Structures are given as structure tokens and as C-alpha cells.
Amino acid sequence: MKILVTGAAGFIGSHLCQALLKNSAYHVVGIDHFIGPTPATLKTGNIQSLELNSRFQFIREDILNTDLSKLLQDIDVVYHLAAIPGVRTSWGKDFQPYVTNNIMVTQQLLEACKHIKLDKFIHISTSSVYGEKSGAVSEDLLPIPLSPYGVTKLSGEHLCHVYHKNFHIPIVILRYFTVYGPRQRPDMAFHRLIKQMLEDKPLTIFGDGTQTRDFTYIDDCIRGTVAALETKKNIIGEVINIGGKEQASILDIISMLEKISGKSATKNFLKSVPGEPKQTWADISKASTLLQYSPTVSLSDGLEAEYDYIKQLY
Amino acid sequence: MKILVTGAAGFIGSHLCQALLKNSAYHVVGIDHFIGPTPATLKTGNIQSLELNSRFQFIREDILNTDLSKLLQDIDVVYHLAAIPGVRTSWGKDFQPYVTNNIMVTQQLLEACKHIKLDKFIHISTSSVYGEKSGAVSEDLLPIPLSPYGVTKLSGEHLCHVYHKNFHIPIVILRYFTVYGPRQRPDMAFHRLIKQMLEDKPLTIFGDGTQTRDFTYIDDCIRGTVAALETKKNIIGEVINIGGKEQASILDIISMLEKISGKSATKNFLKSVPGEPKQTWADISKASTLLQYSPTVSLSDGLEAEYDYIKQLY
Ligand SMILES: NC(=O)c1ccc[n+]([C@@H]2O[C@H](COP(=O)([O-])OP(=O)(O)OC[C@H]3O[C@@H](n4cnc5c(N)ncnc54)[C@H](O)[C@@H]3O)[C@@H](O)[C@H]2O)c1
Ligand SMILES: NC(=O)c1ccc[n+]([C@@H]2O[C@H](COP(=O)([O-])OP(=O)(O)OC[C@H]3O[C@@H](n4cnc5c(N)ncnc54)[C@H](O)[C@@H]3O)[C@@H](O)[C@H]2O)c1
Ligand SMILES: O=C(O)[C@H]1O[C@H](OP(=O)(O)OP(=O)(O)OC[C@H]2O[C@@H](n3ccc(=O)[nH]c3=O)[C@H](O)[C@@H]2O)[C@H](O)[C@@H](O)[C@@H]1O
Ligand SMILES: O=C(O)[C@H]1O[C@H](OP(=O)(O)OP(=O)(O)OC[C@H]2O[C@@H](n3ccc(=O)[nH]c3=O)[C@H](O)[C@@H]2O)[C@H](O)[C@@H](O)[C@@H]1O
């Protein structure tokens, strides 16, 4: 088929394109405006290989300015990953690009998909929509975001449901849980903490470090994401959690990084940042059932992979 | 005490201001940018009756072009009604004004209220957030909007929760159910059908006319809205349905209108329009407990009042 990947030069999008291109029967169109928290230099690195592949077409344009008629011509599947993704930087004057790139972009894509015959529109969303929840969260749980970011991503999900129900756009929603590994964005905790540790600079901890995440290794995330395309079973209209092998606190992670480096971290404990939950924890039963999803990369292996990537990057 | 009412020149806002001005204790500031579906001619008359009262101050400005710090210094309570409200006109290129005036306006007001000492931030929302549900809907039900309009309004609610949890802004959310009576917007069903019936023209019905609403008479809406200010109970953080005395389908309303006009209407059944639920039905248990809310205006009395107003307007 022809598969459109929005946000193709980003962390997850770059990996997803590479995975799809291993199947000789797939042709990939990647669109990326090179905005958000990752510098354009890192994004060029993410796609340099991809651009050599003859079955990849790269478009460096804003989805809000591009000819969406041309873009979606003969597209069989859309993977919509384009977004402004930072939890902590979505307040005051920094909110507008979240609304433009998370809400207006999703709506304009969904409008463009009304007059074409997609197999699937695979919309990427976030554990950030759940907000502050206790236990493993299931996809039927009432979402109450804690960040303006989370609000804009949940508005994107609701636009998906509006366009599915009214115009039969074949939407599938994936909710990722804190994805890490090679090419992780430089605003995320593991990139920052590894870069700090490499430079013998203080590790920046927001609050006391006891907060936990369901960290998902990139290869696990991509296996789940590709499974959503490749299943022959009806998952249209479904919201599916994609979570990781092993939860950990930021203190637990730092201890694991010290074992990889053989260094001892200097720690700087900052104020908690408004808008962050203290815990995330996916119930991935539905992904297990629908996609045969099971994450297999341990934090020790995934963290070594990221540490190696960050060291070579800088 | 001093009360800011956004969207003060609008249908519900103008009636709200009118009700608050009856209390000589209350100083009222109205702000309205004269946008949305109602032509500015009808809104002028709204602010003209309000401006007879010395305790009313009117600001004719976009909330996005206002010094909100300056405005809010002496404000005790905000009623936030300003929005783009039409369910049916929120598709395609019409969507952006809903994002601007429903999402960016709400965010920017909440940002300005972060360091104000408010008693209450009373955010007006809509039954449109629920989408299609069976039975009387309670406020803890998972909302799945059917329209882009509904998505933008539920995004505003989510912003209220974010700013409440992170910054202790004392938000209360009211979900209104299809409000009618004198001053009803010309794009709403009762206004169009009464105008049509008055001029012996076909009554335009969008589908089979079996659609029903929990229609709320304006005076009932306003009594519940004023109760949110005056209640003895703690309602900070609550979502509260404000629904009407009697549910009806459009066919029923057309029969009730024939009784009032003494006319037999010609019907013009048109294609159902995307993004509209078939039923709305409020569980008003919570309003009854927290606000002593009981709607008291019957459809026959309310339609008569709206009939007399439409007759007078044209
Ligand atoms: N990284 C995670 O932990 C994680 C977890 C949950 C969900 N998500 C979601 O996964 C997706 C990918 O996240 P990521 O970490 O790869 O982020 P990223 O910033 O690395 O990638 C997103 C890409 O979208 C592009 N983009 C944004 N707006 C655009 C526009 N208007 N037109 C064209 N391109 C545009 C950016 O240039 C960027 O390269 C996002 O939707 C994010 O919300 C990520
Ligand atoms: N009418 C109903 O049946 C109903 C039911 C549910 C909820 N609501 C909600 O009630 C509120 C009032 O609805 P209404 O029927 O009175 O609508 P309306 O259009 O009569 O009034 C809203 C007013 O907001 C003003 N406004 C919009 N954007 C603005 C901005 N940026 N700055 C300043 N003013 C701005 C408009 O000029 C308009 O006069 C809305 O929030 C709507 O979503 C209405
Ligand atoms: O799962 C998700 O939906 C979200 O996951 C991540 O968001 P976040 O959980 O903030 O991921 P990190 O940035 O890796 O933060 C993880 C934890 O580390 C903490 N942190 C972060 C950065 C840092 O320098 N120090 C620090 O202690 C944060 O407080 C947080 O508790 C992504 O950045 C989002 O794009 C995505 O939506
Ligand atoms: O309750 C709500 O939350 C919403 O109520 C109304 O929206 P709507 O329910 O569309 O109200 P009307 O415009 O009065 O429409 C009611 C019904 O009449 C129908 N209709 C409308 C107009 C018309 O000419 N003919 C007709 O049959 C519609 O299809 C709908 O089923 C308001 O317009 C919204 O601002 C508000 O958000």
C-alpha cells in the first residue's frame, strides 16, 4: 500500500518509517515541518537513512499549508504522529502551537480523509489524556488531563471519534506511555539525564524522583504500532494502550544509569512542574488481545541502547 | 460584589446580566466582541436594555485583545459564556473560529485568573459534550462529542479542570441543555420554526423530526446560573447539568406551536445534518442537591413567550 506518516522525522515517526520500509510491499510518504522541542539537526539525523530508500518520499512542509488533496492521493493508511508533544511547556503563550499543531492539524487531516478510501487512520495519542489515575489504566476510563498538552491531545482523539461516527473515517487510536530509546527527543527525562551524566553535570529531578512511568521501549512501541496496521481483525473505532515491559521511578532509572556509566550522579532536586501526574501505568490487556502485543525490552537493555545513542550523538 | 460576564451581548449572557442587575448589591461588567451567528443589530438591543442600569459597564472588545489583568483586578466572580455556539456550522473552514473563541479564549481567561482572588469562575458548557447517550445523562458519564463544536466546548471544560487542579482557580462548570425563550439566537430551531410559522412558510425539519431535546426555558437556565453564585453548598470543581421542565421532539414542538398560533404548519423535511444527537436528556439530580434547581416553566408557557418575542422582533 502507500502509507502516510505525519511527523515522520521525529523520534517515533522516524523509527516507524524505518520499520514499515522493511516490508518491500510498503511505500511510505513522510511529512514533517521540523518544529517542536527537537532541533532540526537531530531530525536530519533521524531521516538521513530513510531518504536513501527509494520507497520513501519525504515532504518538509506544514500539514496546515500543504495541499492535502495531493498528500492523501492514493494513500491506503495514515499514521498521524505529528504533534507538539512536551507535557511541561504548554502554559501561557506556549499553548497556541499545541492548539494549532494538535487540534487544527488533526481536524484538517480528518476533513481531507472524507473524500478518499483509507483502510485505516491510525491516530497516535498519549497516556497524558488520563491525567492522575491510580492502578493500571484501561481505555474505558474517564480521561481528566492534568496538562494543557494533554487537553489538546484528547481534543484530537474526540475529533477522530467525530469524523469516524459522521463520515466513517476508519480511525484507530493508540495511546503510548513514555517512549524511550535511541532518537528520544532531547526534552524527555532519559535524554536529559544521560546527557547530564555524560557531561558530569547535575541530574535534574522534578520533585523528589519517586514519580513513576510505564516506560515503553521504542522497538516495543513500533511493534505495537505496526501490529495495528497489519491485523486483519476489525479494530476500527478502538482506543488501545501501548505500554512497556517495566515501570520505574526516576530514582530507579538514575541508579540503573549509574550502573551503566560506573559514575555517581550529582542530583539537583527541582520544584515539581504543574501538569505532571505522579504515576502512569498502562493496562495493556486490550493490546495483548487485539494486536498480540507484548513488550519484551527490559529497562537495563533499553537504557544501554539510549545511553550508547546519546554518547555517540554528542 | 463585582461580576464579569463574558458574551454579555448574547442570548443567555444578556438575560444573565439582566437577572444579576436586579440585585442592587451586584456591579456587572459585560464584555462582548459581537461575533458568532447572531447579527450585531440584535445584540445592540441586548446591551441597550442592560445599559439603562448604572451598575452595568459594557466593554466592546475581543477577550483576546483585552488587558485581562486590568479588567480582573476588582472582579469577584467570572461567568464565562463567550463562545461560538452553533452545533451544525463547525465543519471544514468554519472550525477555526470555534478553536479560537472556545479554546484559546478560555485558556487566556484562566491564565489571567491564576493570581486574581476569585470567589468563583463559572464556566458555561453544553449538553453537546455528551454526544449520543441512552437515558438521562449524569455528569460523571464519559463524554464523546458528535460535533467539532462539542469537541471545542469539552476542551474548555478540560482547561478549567487543569487550571483548578494546578492553580486553585475556583471553577464550576454548568452544562446547559438547548435553551430557548425571548432573545433566542436566530440560528436555533424554535426561532426559525416560529419565524417560519408566523410568515406561513414551510417549517424546515433536519431529519424525521423525531429528535428530542431537554429544552430549558431561559428563566430556568438563569435561576440555576444565579444559584451557582448564591448557593450555600460548596460546588467548586463540580460539573452540573442545567436541564428543562419537559423533553419534546421537534414534531411535538411543531404541534405545540400550532396550538399557540392557531395555524396548521406546512412541514419541509430535510436531510439530517452531521454532528447532531437524536436525543438529549439531563439527569438534574446534582443541580437539585447542590443548587436547589427545579425548572418551573412549561413548554406551552415558554413557547408562548418566545412566540410573542419573535412576533415583536419582525
Ligand atoms: N515520545 C513519547 O513518549 C510519546 C508518548 C505518548 C504519545 N506520544 C505522541 O507520539 C507522537 C510522536 O511523538 P515524538 O516523541 O516522536 O515527537 P517528535 O516531536 O519527535 O515528533 C513529532 C513530529 O511532528 C512534526 N510536526 C508537528 N507539527 C507539524 C505540522 N503542523 N506539520 C508537519 N509536521 C509537524 C514535528 O516536526 C516533529 O518532528 C506525538 O503525537 C506525541 O504526542 C509520544
Ligand atoms: N443557547 C443554547 O441553547 C446553549 C446551550 C448549551 C450551552 N450554551 C452555551 O452558552 C453560552 C452562550 O450561548 P448563547 O446562545 O447565548 O450564544 P450567543 O452567540 O448569543 O452569545 C455568545 C457571545 O459571545 C461573544 N463572544 C464570542 N467570542 C468572543 C470573544 N473572543 N470575545 C468576546 N466576546 C466573544 C459573541 O459575540 C456572542 O454575543 C455559550 O458558551 C454556549 O456554548 C448555549
Ligand atoms: O506518556 C505520555 O503520554 C508522554 O510521555 C512523555 O512525557 P513525560 O512522562 O513527561 O516523559 P519524560 O519527559 O521522560 O518525564 C518522565 C518523568 O521524569 C521527570 N523528569 C523529566 C525530565 C527531567 O529532566 N527530570 C525529571 O525528573 C518528569 O517529572 C516525569 O515525572 C512524552 O514527553 C510526551 O510527549 C508523552 O505524551
Ligand atoms: O444543548 C446544547 O448543548 C446546544 O443546544 C443548542 O443546539 P441544538 O441542540 O442544535 O438546538 P437547536 O438549534 O434548537 O436544534 C434543536 C433540534 O432542532 C433541529 N432543527 C434545527 C433547526 C431547524 O431549522 N430545524 C430543525 O429541525 C435540529 O436538528 C435539532 O435536533 C444550541 O444551539 C447550542 O449552542 C447548544 O450547545
Q: Please give the full DSSP string across B142-166, using - where no structure is assigned.
A: ----SSHHHHHHHHHHHHHHHHHHH
CA of A83 to the centre of ligand 1 (A): 4
Neighbours of B112 (CB within 10 A): 19
Q: Give counts: helices (H), strands (E), chain B.
A: 11, 13
Whole-number Å distance between alpha carbons of A183 and A35: 15
Q: What determination technique applies here?
A: X-ray
Q: Which three cell numbers stand for residue A174?
A: 493508540
What is the spatial distance between Cα B81 and Cα A10, in angstroms, rounded to a whole number?
39
H or E stretch at B230: helix B218-230
Residue among A167, A73, A164 nearest A121 (CA): A164
Residue B271 C-alpha cell reads as 436531510
At residue B77, the 3 state secondary structure works out as: strand
Alpha carbon nearest to ligand 4 atom 22, residue: B189
B87 touches chain A (CB under 8 A): no
Q: B26, B98, B149, B163: which is the annotated catalytic residue?
A: B149
Torsion angle of C-alpha atoms A17, A18, A21, A22, degrees rounded to 10: -140
The Cα–Cα gap between A276 and A89 comes to 11
Q: How many CB atoms lie within 10 A of CB A20?
A: 24
Nearest CA among B7, B205, B224, B214 for reference residue B127: B214
Smallest Cβ–Cβ distance between B96 and the set A104, A146, A165 belongs to: A104
The sign of the dihedral angle between the CA atoms of B298, B300, B303, B305 is negative
Dist CA A268 CA B13 (whole Å): 50
B146 vs A154: CB contact, 8 Å cut-off?
A: no
Q: Resolution of the coordinates in A?
A: 1.8
Question: Which residue range is the domain that position B74 belongs to?
Answer: 2-179+215-242
Q: Which ligand is nearest to the CA of A39?
A: 1
Task: Determine how β-strand A248-249 pairs with β-strand A77-80.
Answer: unpaired
Report, as residue numbers or ranges, the catalytic residues of A: 149
